[PDB]
Design a protein around this ligand. Sequence first.
Ligand SMILES: [Cs+]
Ligand SMILES: [Cs+]
Ligand SMILES: [Cs+]
Ligand SMILES: [Cs+]
Ligand SMILES: [Cs+]
Length: 138
Amino acid sequence: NITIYHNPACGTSRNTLEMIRNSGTEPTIILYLENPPSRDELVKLIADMGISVRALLKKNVEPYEQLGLAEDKFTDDQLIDFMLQHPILINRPIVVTPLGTRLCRPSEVVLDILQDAQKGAFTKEDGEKVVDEAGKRL
Ligand SMILES: [Cs+]
Ligand SMILES: [Cs+]
Ligand SMILES: [Cs+]
Ligand SMILES: [Cs+]
Ligand SMILES: [Cs+]
């Protein structure tokens, strides 16, 4: 039972999705930009990810800029509510498996929470080798 909060336009997100598949399972895919998590779900994801709320914020997007979120003037719950109202602010991808939840940045972080080993070598779309045929991380 695996869930990925996915942006098809994000390289990291695509690489993550394919490494999930290369472990032998097809995840549930949530297009978070159109279908974001509810507040309770987002609070849980952050807790499980063990990062700060601010660490989940995506920079270099219109609401981050226009809402001035770079500045340290926002409580965690103010930031959580911005993410729910403007889901492009949620960094990506987030993956949930029976072992845990991670912000998979870089994509190969997902290897931590995939229960089954990569079934063969994995090379990222830009050619960066990740695991060899033997299964060793490079
Ligand atoms: Cs499986
Ligand atoms: Cs939801
Ligand atoms: Cs806009
Ligand atoms: Cs693992
Ligand atoms: Cs890249």
